Write a protein that binds this ligand. Sequence first.
Ligand SMILES: *N[C@@H](c1ccccc1)C(F)(F)C(=O)O
Ligand SMILES: *N[C@@H](c1ccccc1)C(F)(F)C(=O)O
Ligand SMILES: *N[C@@H](c1ccccc1)C(F)(F)C(=O)O
Lengths: 641, 640, 640
Amino acid sequence: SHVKDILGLINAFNEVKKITVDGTTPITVAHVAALARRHDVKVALEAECRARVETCSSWVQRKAEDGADIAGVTTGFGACSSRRTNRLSELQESLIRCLLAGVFTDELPATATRSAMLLRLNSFTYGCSGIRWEVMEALEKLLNSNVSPKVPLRGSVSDLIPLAYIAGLLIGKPSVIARIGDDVEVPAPEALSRVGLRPFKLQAKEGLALVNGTSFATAVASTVMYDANVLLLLVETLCGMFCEVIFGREEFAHPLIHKVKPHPGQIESAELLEWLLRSSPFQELSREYYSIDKLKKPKQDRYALRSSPQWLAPLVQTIRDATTTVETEVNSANDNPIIDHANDRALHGANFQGSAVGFYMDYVRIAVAGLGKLLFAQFTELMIEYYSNGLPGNLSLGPDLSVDYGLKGLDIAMAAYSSELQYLANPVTTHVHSAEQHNQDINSLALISARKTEEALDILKLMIASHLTAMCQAVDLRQLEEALVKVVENVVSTLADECGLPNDTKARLLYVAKAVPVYTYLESPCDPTLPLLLGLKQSCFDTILALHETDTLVDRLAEFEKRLSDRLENEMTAVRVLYEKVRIQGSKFLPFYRFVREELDTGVMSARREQTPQEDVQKVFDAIADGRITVPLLHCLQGFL
Amino acid sequence: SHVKDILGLINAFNEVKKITVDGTTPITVAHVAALARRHDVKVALEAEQCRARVETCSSWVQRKAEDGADIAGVTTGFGACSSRRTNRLSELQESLIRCLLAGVFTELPATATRSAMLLRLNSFTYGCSGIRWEVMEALEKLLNSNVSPKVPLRGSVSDLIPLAYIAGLLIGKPSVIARIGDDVEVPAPEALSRVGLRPFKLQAKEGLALVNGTSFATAVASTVMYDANVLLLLVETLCGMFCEVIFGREEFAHPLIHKVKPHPGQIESAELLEWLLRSSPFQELSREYYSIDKLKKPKQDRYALRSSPQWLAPLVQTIRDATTTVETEVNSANDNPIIDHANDRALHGANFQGSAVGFYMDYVRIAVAGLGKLLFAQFTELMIEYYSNGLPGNLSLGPDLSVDYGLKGLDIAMAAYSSELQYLANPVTTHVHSAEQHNQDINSLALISARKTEEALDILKLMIASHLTAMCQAVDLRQLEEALVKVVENVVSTLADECGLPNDTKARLLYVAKAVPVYTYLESPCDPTLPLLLGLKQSCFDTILALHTDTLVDRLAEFEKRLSDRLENEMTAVRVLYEKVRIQGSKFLPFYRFVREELDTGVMSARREQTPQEDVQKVFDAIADGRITVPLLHCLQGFL
Amino acid sequence: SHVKDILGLINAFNEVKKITVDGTTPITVAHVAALARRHDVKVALEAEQCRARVETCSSWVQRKAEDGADIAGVTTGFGACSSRRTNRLSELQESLIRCLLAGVFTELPATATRSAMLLRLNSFTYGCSGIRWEVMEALEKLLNSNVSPKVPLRGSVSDLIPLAYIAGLLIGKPSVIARIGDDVEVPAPEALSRVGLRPFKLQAKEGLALVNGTSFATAVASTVMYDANVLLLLVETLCGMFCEVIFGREEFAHPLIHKVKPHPGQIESAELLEWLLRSSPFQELSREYYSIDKLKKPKQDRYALRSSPQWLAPLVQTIRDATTTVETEVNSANDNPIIDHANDRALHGANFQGSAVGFYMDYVRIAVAGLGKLLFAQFTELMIEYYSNGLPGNLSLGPDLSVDYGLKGLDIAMAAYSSELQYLANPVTTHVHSAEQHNQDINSLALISARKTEEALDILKLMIASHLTAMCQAVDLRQLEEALVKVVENVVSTLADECGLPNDTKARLLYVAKAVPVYTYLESPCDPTLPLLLGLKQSCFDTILALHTDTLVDRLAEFEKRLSDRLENEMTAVRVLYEKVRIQGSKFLPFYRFVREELDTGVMSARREQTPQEDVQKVFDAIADGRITVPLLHCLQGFL
Ligand SMILES: *N[C@@H](c1ccccc1)C(F)(F)C(=O)O
Ligand SMILES: *N[C@@H](c1ccccc1)C(F)(F)C(=O)O
Ligand SMILES: *N[C@@H](c1ccccc1)C(F)(F)C(=O)O
């Protein structure tokens, strides 16, 4: 299952200490994200591939000096390949001068730049580039010392310009500013000095080897894919939590439905959902709910739940397939020419072309928009009492609703999030311009597309934060609902006894107490115009007709109504105040609820809780953003398969 | 390789005579396309494999419904109205169809409608729907007799409305119009009567079972995917023909380049291209071209060729992966509720949701726009003399270029095609509205997206037809080029002898004859301002300096004189002969022969009265109708 | 107001008999639409006005060209080939047409082609083109004889290729096919023969003059803009009908709201709605409805109604501004070079560039998607009982809702329509490719854009047809609702008397009869679990408490029981009578009368055999063919 694979990715991300870089061991997107996000993670360039790098650089320098005809080595660049030259080093310097052509408006973050440095280093290990081993050592040292050039955001059609800043750092260009850690910014020569390095003088092919790759597009794509995997699993998992709070019917996940429409992501998402819901105490409450006035309640849930495995299917498949493609790029010799020293030739192709990554970034962004739409639809149902099977509008606890609009602010924001996400999911690859003196008449735009997919995932994180916050609110509301109905049942049962009401009467009144949704009268339980009293009055008329001594019965019914308005509200208030100052304990989602409520220190939202929706959602968003959210996720999924 | 898989689809499409429909044998996109496109193809619904499970299921449903089992859309209302119950089993199903006959004629083609009928029939064979066997037999007979309802284009969010027209035909609704073949349209009851059927009276679940599927989206997606596979292979293949006519360097396809960046589609497209170009006689002309004035010509080709395997990789993978997804949908019980009669349950889910198809239709449309951009970039290079390595601008033969703008009209149209294609490739699935009393708060829009991808492929067909036409033109221009240079060399060599020029002078003049691109002076070979005489004059001045006289000057003046007597006539003669060879040893011979001989065309010029339209129409028609697969399969004979 | 301007356009469309083409009188979008759609409308080319300047100009060009003047595309090659000079004046023009007959049939409708012919003729009247007057006479004759070439859909980046087919017809190219009326297709030479014309022999500049224009993009844009104006006014107007049936509060249109946020389209749409709603019998019912249980009902309407003027503002302004721009293009010399014969120069520019039209087609398509979203929002509200203030879900009459899903099918199609419309409204102009040997490195794509906006308007027409059909259903439901509540009140009143209930009891019971929405219990009025009996039970218990006996209880039990004697029977009788009033005093009467009486429809239900398709088709056809303007103009009589 993809679920196992994604669990493996999260474990790899957490557990890795050293990234082995050797030209044979694959680097995964979890490795890239770990390097970028955990500075205790170190690169270990393992020589055992040094010999082949050396053979390659020796071949290049010798052949170039002998006058071999090799594009971008003894010839001009791009559309200028007709021009030949024996000025081997000057050719390489002229390239970097030409490409230091970005403008600061905004910049690629250090996370992306360090990731790109890793990916360039990795490419060099295959022994096809002709770069000196010493330059590779320097990259390893820069990576492990938290040094990176400041790189302008735009200019790549995929990654000459941004890679030129890494080259600029290595050759000690004074105009190139380098970061060391979070605040220090110094010119390149002093950055090199601070970490015990000296500037390189570029030899044959070395300028081109440094800039002629897909490292920035693929770096961003790697963290994008790591995040898309984690957030996909989170969304699939939270569909079960939605089913719990909305009073869904877990049958939507039945294996036979999916066996007969066997898209792999459809089968796998449902398999997870069936397992999450199998022993659910909330599904027990759901069954009890639909057995009361069965024929007045929907037979099936709305699509945002019942259709979730069908919806998720292409999203799972897209994200998993795109992960394979990005990792193939990470572990490639993206460079040109490709030096085949074993056969004494330089091969002229286009491995710098980032089209595999670019197209898949467009697809993943559409899939991400699909995930956001699922979240938006679920959230919408949860906010509307007509669709939420007993929950109050806006998940407002009240009881005074005139001064408690609940999660209405979050609801409005969810629409804004989904709307921007759908806009972002238009493709970038459809916008190919004929570029660079018409030499680059197809080009991938892969870094641009990866950047837009990253922006989409940022919005998805916000939507997940909100949805999880709303579902924790709904857990509290469902627990309080159960406690409140029992209080109402007990008060009605005991007052029927006290007032000496007949059994026909007692049975009718208890039915009303069980059947009427408590959140419809919580605001003023003894209001004669609200559903509890309306139900009770209807039943009182019916019992009088059924039993038709009349005057003594009426006497006792009037007394019942009097004592109800003296005690009911007080008992309902007490249980609520107690709750503010259980089913979730038996649920697979207990780790999420516990994390949000206890670990992040939050509570049921109301006019009495002084923290803002911002303050609460911020805590959840921060935990999604920094990866702490994977702890409850892995706890929740323990034992699955 | 995907190449063998696609060849397999093509052979299946052409070879199938009967489509077996039995609940276990898979239907591929080739089977769907063959049914749609070849009326000789018949459906064979196999009773022995599946009648028993179908009958068990319908009996179960009718018995449970009559006993008051609570089953959504069977004893309850539809969609947002599932909370209402009823024992009016038939009337409930009638009311559904009445409600859904809601399209407007401002239609879906018969190909798509018959494909959808096939797909609905297939869904029923899994024994989860509750429909009667007799209705399935009626669908088979309608399919085999070329009877299908006229269906409105729009209304589906994925396929209640369009499927209701098939239901409408089955129950003999007078407002539903049915085609019988190409020439007859009659009301539904008359159609049933003409093929010996009577209208069905809907039983429990049967109206819902007929409409609650993904049949139209998946029907369109199936022919879309068949076409996308064929056109993909054609585009990949034609990258090799482009290399041949543009004077490319075949090294771009070297397997080591792709071994070190091993996207499967990159490896596999390069593998095909290496094989197509191996020992090519055109690649031999290319080598010679780059050996002449070597240091003044590009070391590498432009991206439209050199970067082609890298570009193709995601496009190959998208199209092959979408094919798998669409075929899983074709072979699924797309219906709800799903009847597990063996365990006495009606299972409530959403197999009517066409999301797997819809999302993949969005992706394929992006991939098709990628294929179009590749074609546009190659065609652009081919039209511009600065980028075509000796070819004339617009592939104009002339010789009089003032009255021959060649393929400039096709070039303009290629920009228009690519532009519209890029626009079409925006996603449909990003436009989900919360629909049907907010019950359908996610919905796939799969049929809309499939229709847009279908529109995109129509345009790609146009682009391939033009590109292939242009490359046949370029084949003729390269062959004429080789013949012309030999004539110029012969005339120069024999006039050098005749005029008694030194061996030094003879050699210099022959180099110019070899080096100057003939298309730069074909218009007026002896014009002193054009590159032939310009090179000759330069060489004549140098030779006077190297030998320094009065008689040498006399002889060189006699050479120039005699050149203007002889050269143009001999060049005209060889061109005229050509209009009234390397391609014979090229793997692309079957394409050139198909376009020139079988479709009856010729090198384009002011002397050929057929318009670019007339020539491209023939090629486009052969792409549209499948004839193009013959030269394609011939071309690839022996590959792997 | 833009309202008066649109009424002006409609009147012109209907009343024009002859289009005057004279080089000074403007042609509007109503004129283009009328020529395209009304064949009795004839072109009148006026010689006295512009023949002299035409003849002066064609004489200047022929003389200058024959004398060797250097003029692009006249004595030089075309586009990227302008450096090539020639004295082959006629053959240069022939070579252009040959090169541009490059479209493929996979076609533009005759309406668009004939509109394009009108527009090319118009451009020629400015006397800047050099075309012969006789060619202009031939276009007038072809137009008036209903002869037009068959033109391929694609190939223009804006309109050389499609215009080449008009040129092909005029010069009698055999490969060009011509329509004569609805039924006849012949080769171009026979078409000319039948109208007494002979093939033209192109003189200097004339091939270019025929093709170097924006005629097709602008022809499509003209009918698009005419339709956008009519449909805009229809949507605005129908917002008032929506208010009436939804029980809106007309105060949203109050002039002060819009004076303080004075976007011209906001003020003018609100001004119309204020006037439409001012003496409304439905707004009277609305106010009565909100006076009953006032504090339990919304203070404000939802945005689809209350925010309509603010929403409409940019859409009105976009559509009106685009009309101006399109008309400027219709009335322009879109040609190149521009001959200034009076100053003896040929001016080299780019008036063939259709960028003004292209960009505005993108904007209008965005505005059309805005209008579609407004209709979708209103339709959605109307289908959902929680949002419709007493109307039944799906506007189902029932009474048995288990077999009446009302307009659910139409609701689903409205989501499908809006979804596709939002997708279409992505821009085309963002997809400029560098075209035609990189000569056309900016190009407008105006025809492609115009075509997409036309497709969006087709969808908007379907949405308006559905929305108007739904609102007529709602009118019937509101009128029936008022009649039904009166029946319930009378039954309750008389039974309360007959059972000898106290006056206080009678008054409480009557309040329930008035306050409970009748559509919540119409299905089974005496059902003890539905809201009528629930309210009566509560009231009966409260009476017992208030007066706290055995005779009171006996009489209350009799009241309840006798309710099932008469109530359902009288409610059935009044409904059945209705099936076989407020709208008579409403400004929307003409629409209701048009849909019900003129189109022959009725309140939708399980008893009415017509399908939703059959009903919506009639409304759609009337929108499409312009009949809908009759009730629109009647509705608006007396406005300002
Ligand atoms: N990627 C190409 C390039 C183009 C412009 C400037 C620098 C480099 C390349 F020419 F170097 C190549 O390897 O194809
Ligand atoms: N697909 C659903 C439907 C909705 C509206 C009209 C007809 C059918 C369904 F309700 F039938 C379902 O199976 O969920
Ligand atoms: N619009 C130009 C053109 C380009 C290619 C073929 C025909 C015409 C033009 F060159 F004619 C011009 O007027 O700029």
